Symmetry: D2
């Protein structure tokens, strides 16, 4: 007999595992427990802070929910109006020394005239070929060219995506992008070129809220706080080292054993295979591909410069900087960095030189958060990446050479993005059912490896839905039908369902 026994064991307390926990806690039927190797829940949705008091998420994290259930849990956890700030998405693409509103491909109207001609010519070819097309594109690259034309492909789509995915567009599928990549209408784009107009509102994150305190990580700490503490195990005491699928037994690092009837595993599925010592699974998970994410944080002295303004996040397709994206993280909440009265010495000028004075001085302060991808196809020099980022900020005019930097942050996250490669699905339809036969629900950003349902809300609901399938025979809709859930408001499942209303009488 094992040390502990539960009907449902949840591994991991990022958004996916917490979703499982929350639904299990609502149903309040089967016994359960949730473990995490980190004392602080949140996973890639966590927040670090520098010794100087600057917060950094794991890159730009902006919340946009497709589900009422997710909203219910966030509102429960952070119930007050001043727990949140609401912002409009102000996003731009750095191109040729200018800021082009997102989406690029719908704002051709802002480029030099010569490039406008190239882009519109390319789009005209695309439109005429689309008129007679009777086959679907097979690669991301093919998709880009069919919907945007070469001009736009070559100018922004191709270089930016290599810069983010860390694999060429020719290596990825295209079934995943309905809600990620705006497809330009020929007439609309041409109309804006003629009028000199802009169109900055495409997409599900055009308006967003952000937690007042603790960064994104504050959400998941507060959500975890609503769970019964005795059913949790976070820290070194909660680290899973072995999974024995056949005895339905999990062994923790400190030697504790947990028996289960059903397993919801939210750790990276490649790690789960290793932990299962299942050599067949190990070989299959090695057919998946992922990229690593470097997060660089820069704290800057001064009131927010006019050139920065209300910008939220920014795209960089060009070669004068190594990052693909920057976030004005200090725009998301005044508690993301120190108050103006805080005294801090300058560490360096943006041009790389030493400050004229070592003396601690006051603020105010603003804050830039940068992302750089890495993979076997796109290596990164880890030793110079911080300095390269800072020079890139100067190159792109986001920082003046004489700006004073008071804090720096750099952390590499090994599993950053699960890549939608051509091979992804053929591999997953082997992996997931094989795990499913053993009563293991592997779910989440790396649990199930599907980026198109890979944000905080998708993840949370993958966990909720896994439980709902285990207990109530529900369809796992987010897992198997991303386009279905992303194309509708999912209003039906609530934190208080009829089951609880009727039970309370």
């Amino acid at each position: 007999h094992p040390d502990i026994s539960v009907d449902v064991l949840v591994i991991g307390a990022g958004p996916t595992g917490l979703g499982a926990a929350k639904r299990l806690n609502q149903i309040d039927g089967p016994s359960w427990m949730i473990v995490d190797s980190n004392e602080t829940p949140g996973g890639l949705a966590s927040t670090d802070v520098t010794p100087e008091g600057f917060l950094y998420d794991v890159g730009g994290h902006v919340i946009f929910s497709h589900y009422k259930y997710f909203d219910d849990c966030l509102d429960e956890a952070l119930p007050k109006e001043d727990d949140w700030y609401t912002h409009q998405r102000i996003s731009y693409v750095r191109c040729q020394g200018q800021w082009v509103p997102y989406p690029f491909q719908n704002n051709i109207s802002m480029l030099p005239k010569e490039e406008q001609v190239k882009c519109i010519d390319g789009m005209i070819d695309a439109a005429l070929e689309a008129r007679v097309a009777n086959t679907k594109p097979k690669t991301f690259d093919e998709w880009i060219v069919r919907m945007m034309g070469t001009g736009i492909a070559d100018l922004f789509m191709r270089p930016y995506n290599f810069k983010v995915w860390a694999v060429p567009t020719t290596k990825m599928q295209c079934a995943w992008l309905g809600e990620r990549v705006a497809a330009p209408n020929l007439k609309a784009v041409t109309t804006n070129v003629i009028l000199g107009k802009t169109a900055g509102n495409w997409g599900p994150n055009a308006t967003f809220r952000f937690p007042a305190r603790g960064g994104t990580g504050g959400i998941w700490i507060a959500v975890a706080n609503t769970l019964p503490k005795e059913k949790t195990r976070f820290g070194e005491k909660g680290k899973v080292t072995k999974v024995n699928a056949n005895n339905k037994t999990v062994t923790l690092q400190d030697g504790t054993t947990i028996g289960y009837k059903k397993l919801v595993s939210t750790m990276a599925v490649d790690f789960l295979a290793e932990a299962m010592n299942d050599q067949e699974l190990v070989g299959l998970t090695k057919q998946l591909f992922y990229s690593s994410t470097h997060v660089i944080g820069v704290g800057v002295r001064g009131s927010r410069p006019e050139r920065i303004g209300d910008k939220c996040w920014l795209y960089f397709p060009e070669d004068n900087c190594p990052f693909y994206r920057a976030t004005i993280f200090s725009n998301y909440s005044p508690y993301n960095q120190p108050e103006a009265s805080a005294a801090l010495p300058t560490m360096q000028l943006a041009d790389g030189s030493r400050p004229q004075s070592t003396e601690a001085k006051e603020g105010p302060y603003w804050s830039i958060m940068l992302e750089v991808s890495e993979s076997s196809m796109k290596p990164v020099n880890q030793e110079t990446i911080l300095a390269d980022c800072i020079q890139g900020l100067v190159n792109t005019e986001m920082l003046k050479p004489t700006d004073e930097i008071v804090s720096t942050y750099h952390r590499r996250f090994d599993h950053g993005y699960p890549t939608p490669t051509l091979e992804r699905e053929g591999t997953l339809t082997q992996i997931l059912p094989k795990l499913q036969d053993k009563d293991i629900w592997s779910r989440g950003r790396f649990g199930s490896w599907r980026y198109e349902v890979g944000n905080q809300d998708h993840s949370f609901m993958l966990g909720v839905e896994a439980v709902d399938n285990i207990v109530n025979g529900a369809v796992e809709l987010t897992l198997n039908y991303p386009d279905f859930v992303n194309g509708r408001q999912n209003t039906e499942r609530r934190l208080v369902d009829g089951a609880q209303v009727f039970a309370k009488s």
Copy 2:
């Protein structure tokens, strides 16, 4: 306060209500109750029998299940292997003196050559147009012609569908047919014409199962029998006459009042609006369209004729008979008609003449079940319809003038088909949300009026999913996403879920 109070009241015990009731019973949480005006559950999936012992469903009823859950409940209700008979899905189109295997277009080699030429030319036109199409069809008629071309459409789908829906194809939408592109398989059609080949869409793996006893109605009696009797109220004692949606009270014909928190209604939504005395809803529901169904049954003496053979159902596009569909119901089970030793006198010969003798003679017997549609656009003379059907049987060569008829059946069903008109969705998206705001889940063939999810399995699951929405916050997928549920096997929901396993 009312005579009875429950959390969830279910009106109607056809497949939909019995679906809600089965799921409520499984969950065993909130209190509930189910009523029906009829003593015998089953609704339009019931079975009648003539005084001569010939059974008739309400027209051809063939089960194709899209759901494990539906299968679980049927298996529980009729668990023995000899409770069912299995058959191949064999169907033919009657056209120009021939029985053409379904699907029609793959079998036009049976027609005269000059006609084959017209059909192929029309389908060539359709293939060439499909190659440059950049719009979706807007009507059932447009959809038909883009799939088949003019010649083939005019022979089968156009005239057949009028005889079925009792409205012209030009007045129906085509979204209910699903997402498949409306375009010909020109190569498949031309290949069968060149090879002079025929081929139906059946075989050892395209089968259905039919109940050994009691017709389709036997299924729902057996399913209803698995419910706790005290939670059911079927018969005159269970007839709903009034629905007060504001008080959440229902009133039965015998005076009994029932209070509910959530109502799952499976009666025709147009009767619901009347029972609610809601003038706005009456006005809206009267904008929906439906056709009535006449079922005619004919019992015939003799062993199964070779010309009939293993045929199950048959389509009739032509105007030499009033029915759109015929079913060799005696092929579905040996118990749908009397055994060979039963003695029955001949009532009349197929040509309408009197028999030589009035004496009772033995069988064996076989049986034909026919459907005739009626609407305001297509009247049916109730006094001559049986005789007109029997003549139709002679005209189509199903009966010989000499065949001996030993039993007849005729019944009219007012709500038969809910029609996919062009206006249907515009009307339903006003009606259903208005009922939802009053905690009324109106669901079913005429509860929600959507034919593409109007079979026995869909209906059942509509009731199941409505309950699952009420209790567990499930998405009502069958209701809102017919293409979704029809394009997959729905395996997740089971008669025994984790919930019940963890409890015991």
Copy 3:
């Protein structure tokens, strides 16, 4: 026996008849003669002069030659360099207060932006339709729309062509426009819009040459003069009143009869039929359709205004003027109007008022030549048309209200344009063979009634080729295959051929 007998008789000494005569004269085989009701050769390619000394062609006459033989004859007739002036082919479309360079569609950058949007949207529709088109257009109107799209068609070609042909575009065929596919050059149009530019279809290469003296009519006078005078009969003495086809006899006004073996008739084919007293042909020829042309000439005091500049001809789709085309005729030759030192009183001002003084003053002068069409579908009031034209000049800002008009000219030409109606070919394929069966070659602008081969060079060559068919068995290519002769360099036939080189040795 008739008064005169010749092998080949030519009726008419416009360009077609002169062409037949030039080739007959060069061949110097069969006997021949040429007659005309007018003392001056030239036909509709003649030139008039006002009492004040302003010349006017029969509306805008600009030579574009498809044939070496035509060039040879023109060069023989006027061999000196200073017999001609050379100009670029400069034309504009008057539209919404703007002079838009031709071709209209490449210059819509001049229109309001909202209008450019509607034009480009229409042309995008047309390009998408053209990509899947599998039929030829059947009417002029369909051809216009397929080439331009709706918005651009409605601005220029549709309303302009009604004002030109005096019949709706939906009533004309479109085969006469040639074999090019009816389809937009969308990229060329959007490119000029994006770059905000204009460009006309003229330059150092795209030029025409115009006679230095006597207007277009001076050409035909000088060509006729190379013919042996004794073989010509121009004037009342040459007016044909009767053609007896069965006897091959023609009767002139003064009672003279001419016998022939072959007849080349260049008179209007409906007059030919009447003169043959052939009731069947009279019936067929009345089934043809033609418009009449009003030519209005206006002489203006002053040096050439800057707003007019180097303009040659101008198109008017709009209804603030009755003319469809204007020509800056004083730009064609300094001898189209009086010298600067010639003195003329002002007759009126452009706004219709009387001059302050009635005295003769000096120039210089410039000159405007206008064209107005008339048909049964489009009446013209002959008594107000001059004054309506002059008001048109003010409305279109060609003249200021103050400009001084020193000469006016108005003449109506009954047969002006042979109309390419839907019915034209059905009728002509009945008429021409019946005349052909009688050894009558009816050829010319109204001799054979085909506008697409209706220019000066086409006409001349219709005569040449008729003769070549009669003598040498040549194919009549211009008559029967307009697209063929218009699409190639016709260099083979020369004013000095092998036959003449060999015979002179």
Copy 4:
């Protein structure tokens, strides 16, 4: 000064040269003469006779005319009704044991059902692709697939065409075939499949005439006979060995020199370049391609077999025989072989064996004429080709093993077909204009190397039109516009033109 001086010299007295000569003789202006290295004119339109009295043309020659001028000359040369026989075309394609009516691609209905399916599927594919095609095919092979689909390309078009052209379909252009290769209509073809009907009437040789005596060579002997003998020089005395284009001098084999003003050359253009000692022209002509033609004749004893019947010519795509075409030459005229009473011994049986008896037996007789192509991509064994042909006749059931062969014939013609290669036009546009600028008109099947205008009537008319361009400035329509002359009735030019009628008075 040379021995002889003429305005126009014609080299070669095949149809092309004779055409020039006839037109020169009709015009009767410039002096001229015609030379040939052969005593008997006719060129590739000549006829041989075996010692046993069997005639053979140079492969199947059938007369079908696009031009009245050609008819006038043939009728003058052979004016009696009994000088000619008229025949319907009875043509078939040998395929899988069956005779499939020509054209193959329009009689799919004759094949076995299984091949019908493959053929129609292929055609459906081509029909759908053609609905959206916006480019022209570049090669003969692409044309074949695009217009007939793969099934018919593989079954007939590809193998047959290599067998005739002696180069693969991928190496030929496709602008030449308007009148040679029927394009199948999907509806028409499938309709006949369904009804089991044939469509045997496509093309310009569906009816033809053949001369009663002397075979095709009889025509050209007779035409040459209408010329003034003193202007002809046929035989070794008329063999051209040198052409000096600068001096405009030609030198004959016997040392005779002829000066000319204009040269019409009809010998193969590669021979002309060598005779000119013009290395650059030799280089260019070596870029052209041609195939050689082996003609095999077989005389057979017996009344015409029933399996043979009224068949005229037959096609053989399959690899069970070397010939691409057989002609039942005895069906064309009773005088193409000996009378029935002529006694002849059997030379061999069709199975290859000798008869022992040398007895001369009577007829009647019938006759088969075969063609085998050869080129550097398709060698032919000249020593066995006769026997291989005869075995081919047995394999295809043309001859029974026991048939008695009484005469055999074999001759190789080096220049047989001028191949329409991809490179042909690019090469001819360098060659023909260069010769033109030296006053050399190179014309004919190998004079100008264009197969689409390479028949007897085309060739004759190339010579006629060259003279007409030289003397009368006529357009050379046959040379430059094959589709124009092939698509119309060419009635204008006649043997007696107006010029001769008028001059005779």
